[PDB]
């Protein structure tokens, strides 16, 4: 697999993000800001979006950290929260796995 | 559409 699926729609990660467990994600393309990406998360009863946005250095960043790379934006949020309404770290491995 | 980091 790939956390990376460009070209599902948002309302299509909102259905493959809904069978995975909390903090699992997928980073498509954006339809609202063609040239950018977002990333979908799965929260505890739905799933919720975020924009990648980029600086004048083309950093990428979702609030005000920035990353030189989106795999480096990846691995941040594995140990520090993507949102700032609840604690969610990004996940790509079961417990068991 | 909507997204959770969206700000002025």
Redesign the interface.
């Known amino acids: 697999g790939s956390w990376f699926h460009e070209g599902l729609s948002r309302h299509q990660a909102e259905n493959l993000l809904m069978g995975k467990e909390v903090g699992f994600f997928i980073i498509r393309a954006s339809q609202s800001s063609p040239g950018d990406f977002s990333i979908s998360v799965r929260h505890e009863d739905d799933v919720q979006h975020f924009k990648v946005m980029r600086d004048n250095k083309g950093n990428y960043f979702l609030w005000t950290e920035k990353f030189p790379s989106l795999n480096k934006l990846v691995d941040y949020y594995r140990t520090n929260s993507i949102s700032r309404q609840k604690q969610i770290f990004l996940r790509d491995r079961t417990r068991e796995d | 559409?909507?997204?959770?980091?969206?700000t002025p």
């Open positions: 559409s909507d997204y959770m980091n969206m």
